[PDB]
Structure formats: C-alpha cells, structure tokens
Design a protein around this ligand. Structure first.
Ligand SMILES: O=c1ccn([C@@H]2O[C@H](COP(=O)(O)OP(=O)(O)O)[C@@H](O)[C@H]2O)c(=O)[nH]1
Ligand SMILES: [Cl-]
Length: 479
C-alpha cells in the first residue's frame, strides 16, 4: 500500500527547522499515508542547530537527513556578505538531488513514491530541483497572511511597475495595499519594503517564484486574518495555524520553576510581561527609559532583559550575571514584590500562566500566536524584519494590540527616524493595555482569539479542514 513522501527543506537555522518539524508532525498524525524527510542545512557558526540536531530521534515515518556541504565549499561561499544566504542555500542543490536518488524514501520496500517539496521562503531555488523530478513544490510561510499580501504588492511595485520603493521610507503618505482595510502609512513599512539593498532584491526575487508553486501553507487561521487571506488568489492558500511548539519546556526548568513559582503568587491577569524575541535587545539609555515607565505605571511586571551583542558581530543577545550593571539605582529594591527582571524567559510557560494579563512584544509572529493562544493582549513595540507590519495589523486592523511605538526600527548596522521611545509612551501604552479590568475591548477580542485559535486546530476547525485539503492535493500528485 504505497504512500506519499514530502521533502521538507527549511531555511537553515533553528526556528525554521523547528517550525518545519511542527507542521510535519501535524501532517503525520493526521494521515497514515504520508512520510516526511526533513533536509537540514547547517551554517558554520550555528550552535543551537548543532545542539538541536543532535537531539533529533528519527521517527519511523520521519527521517531527518543532513545534507550540508563540506567546509571547503561552504567557506568559499562567504564571498558576498549580503548574498551569502542565497548562495549558501543554492550551494546545497547538488546534495539535494543526491538525497533524492540514494537516501530518500523512494525505491520502495512503509516505502513509497516521492510526492512533493515543501520549501521555506528563502528556499525558492529548490523549486528547480523539484521540477527535474517532475514534482510540484510548496511554500510553508511561518509569517502570516498579511505579510504575504504585503510581499505580493511590493513584488508588483518593484518588478511590474518598476517603482523605486525608497520613496515610502518613513513617509507620511498612506498606501493602498491589497489585504489591508485602511491605508498603510509609509512610516510603518518593514525595512525590507523600502531598503534597496542586495538582500531585498534577492528576497523579492523569491517572492516572484511563489507563483510557480502548487500551494502555500501559512501559519495563521481564517478567523484571525480574514481580510488579508481573502485578498490572496494564486496559488491556493492553506491556513493551517496556529502552529506552535509548546513541548520544549526548556532555558531549562529550574529557573522557570522560580519564575513560575513567583507568578503563582501574583493576582490573575495583573502582570504585564516584557519580552522581545530571540535577537531583541536595547541600548543602555533605552533600558533606562523602560524602568521609569514600569515603576510609574503601578502594575506588576515580569521583564526579560538580555544583554546586547558587542555590535561588531558576536551572535545573539546574551544574559547578564547581575542587573546592577543595567538598572537605575534603587529600582531593583523599590519594585520588590511587584516586579521581576530575568534574562531569557520560558515564554510559553509565562504567557500560559493566569497571572500574566499583558504582553509587550516586538510582535514576532510566533510570539504573537503564542500570546493569542492564551488570550493575552499585546503591547506593540516592533523591532526588525516584518514586525512593524505585524504591529500595524494587530493595532489598526485586528484590534488586538495597543501601540507602544509602531514606527520603531532596531538598527543592527549602526536605520530609523526615532532613537528612544519615552517612558511616557511606554507607561501610557501599558496603562491602556491592562486598563478597565476585563471591559478593555482589546483584551476582549484576545479572549475570543484564544477560543478561535483552539477551535481552528480541532476537527471542524478552519485550519483542520484546510490542512486536510493540503494532504489531499499532496496525495493527488502520487495517484
Ligand atoms: O526571551 C525569550 C524570547 C523568545 N523566546 C521564544 O523565541 C520565539 C520567538 O518567536 P518570534 O516569531 O518572535 O521569532 P524572532 O522574531 O525572535 O526571530 C518564540 O517561540 C518564543 O517562545 C523565548 O522563549 N524567550
Ligand atoms: Cl517556554
């Protein structure tokens, strides 16, 4: 009884790999007639993927294959410090076709014909390898539907109408974008839409190749982004989210216990939770401005404070040993019993706790889906990538977040018009986020999304049937 194998090729890096495995197990646990091969690409300096890959146990219907090139080849692929990433992924094209002939599930025997490619956004170069075997490719976007509508619009502005999108940079003119109810102010656009860099022209070349695929799985659900989703036509969109990994309870549990044990002592829906994603940090004078707003607000707070990278290079934000380096004098011993300052945080464990009632966030989409899965309203303080669009959508389109400052951009090169958001903006945003008990109407819809996000994944839900339709078309390639 033959099955169908899907060749998952996520963009390199843990996070993309973890999201690819999450959606892979959703397909395997839904339909017995499918196996999946995840192809891992590893960068040289990526501790974490190396740490995470070693923990991978190959399920009987799920094989994790590592296909990276020898270091001789990879080293010769740093030639362009802004075309590295597209060059690196393309560099694995010959080792992908080798996997198809040797290590894949094909040649039979549980064993079955190859059936499709599910590629990440940065892996559109793999569409051509899938066509050498006369087999359709797919896209799995861990971003949302509104960002796909934004990519289609700016791909059209750049390649079809040949518009120089630099004009919209920090502008006050409002754009009409398919999938956005109200005009989009230019100053809220992600930098990838206005920056004329090398990386963005190669990124929008990948958006042009979205049209060659059979389908696109987006990490959202129909009731969350209804206007953005119904503006997308080619190709067929499958909202299968919210896809999210709760299982990795690890930051291991001993420090989470103290954080959880402390939140257990706080009143319910009373603590506003500070966190800014994997690479989010702040400069000395901005952390200063946050401590004043937190004290001046009067609410309980769990603040995740990480230490910045050296700015030369040097990987991700770290952790402090003591926050005597960072914090204003007396703030620590004055927020005794009301506030706590940590480094890396068990985000899902914190957001699921009943004491947390507000989530100030950079609006990274995985973080947003985690907050909405537990009904926690958001304070929007975006930093990088598409987060400025996530913020504008959550604040102005979905009524699910209060603005801290939507036109904020964290500059890694050492680009923005605003350096410091003030404690007066932070406290006023926090004051509005936790206000009015549970008659806060932004909090009211956050409650609703928790029920709708849970309903979308169970049988009968929009994401459940949409995922069921994705599998049917995948097996329709094999018949
Ligand atoms: O202090 C932190 C910051 C982030 N995360 C986790 O890291 C991911 C961040 O998601 P996001 O979409 O924001 O990705 P990013 O924007 O960080 O690249 C989520 O799964 C969070 O649970 C965490 O556990 N602790
Ligand atoms: Cl967690």
């Amino acid at each position: 009884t033959t099955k169908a194998e899907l060749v998952f090729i996520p963009s390199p890096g843990a996070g993309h790999l973890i999201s690819a495995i999450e959606i892979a197990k959703l397909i395997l646990n839904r339909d017995e007639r499918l196996c999946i091969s995840v192809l891992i690409m590893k960068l040289p300096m990526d501790f974490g993927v190396q740490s995470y890959v070693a923990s991978l146990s190959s399920s009987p219907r799920l094989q994790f294959v590592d296909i990276t090139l020898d270091e001789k080849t990879v080293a010769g692929l740093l030639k362009n410090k802004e075309s590295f990433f597209t060059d690196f992924i393309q560099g694995h094209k010959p080792k992908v076709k080798d996997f198809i002939h040797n290590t894949s599930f094909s040649k039979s025997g549980g064993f079955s014909r190859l059936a499709g490619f599910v590629l990440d956004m940065f892996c559109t170069s793999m569409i051509d390898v899938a066509s050498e075997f006369s087999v359709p490719s797919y896209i799995f976007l861990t971003s949302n539907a509104a960002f796909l509508a934004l990519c289609y619009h700016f791909e059209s502005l750049k390649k079809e109408h040949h518009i120089d999108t630099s004009k919209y940079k920090d502008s006050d003119e409002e754009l009409t974008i398919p999938g956005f109810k109200n005009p989009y102010p230019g100053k809220f656009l992600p930098r990838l839409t206005t920056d004329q860099t090398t990386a963005t022209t190669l990124f929008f070349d990948s958006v042009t190749r979205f049209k060659e695929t059979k389908g696109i799985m987006v990490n959202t659900f129909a009731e969350l982004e209804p206007f953005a989703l119904q503006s997308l036509l080619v190709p067929k969109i499958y909202p299968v989210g919210p896809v999210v990994n709760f299982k990795e309870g690890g930051n291991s549990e001993s420090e989470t216990e103290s954080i959880i044990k402390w939140l257990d002592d706080q009143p319910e829906s009373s603590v506003v939770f500070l966190c800014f994603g994997s690479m989010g940090s702040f400069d000395a004078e901005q952390i200063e401005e946050i401590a004043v707003a937190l004290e001046c607000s009067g609410h309980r707070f769990l603040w995740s404070l990480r230490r910045p990278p050296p700015k030369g290079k040097m990987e991700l934000p770290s952790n402090y040993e003591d926050f005597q380096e960072v914090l204003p004098e007396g703030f620590i011993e004055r927020t005794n019993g009301v506030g706590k300052v940590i480094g890396w945080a068990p985000q899902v464990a914190v957001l699921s706790h009943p004491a947390v009632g507000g989530f100030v966030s950079h609006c990274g989409w995985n973080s947003v889906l985690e907050s909405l899965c537990f009904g926690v309203p958001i304070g929007a303080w975006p930093q990088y990538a598409e987060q400025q669009m996530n913020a504008f959508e959550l604040v102005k389109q979905l009524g699910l977040a209060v603005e801290i400052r939507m036109d904020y951009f964290k500059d890694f090169e050492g680009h923005g018009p605003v350096e410091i958001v003030t404690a007066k903006e932070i406290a006023s945003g926090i004051r509005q986020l936790m206000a009015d008990g549970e008659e806060n109407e932004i909090r009211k819809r956050a409650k609703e999304m928790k029920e709708k996000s849970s309903a979308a994944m169970k049988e009968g839900g929009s994401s459940y049937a949409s995922l069921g339709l994705l599998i049917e078309d995948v097996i329709s390639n094999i018949s």
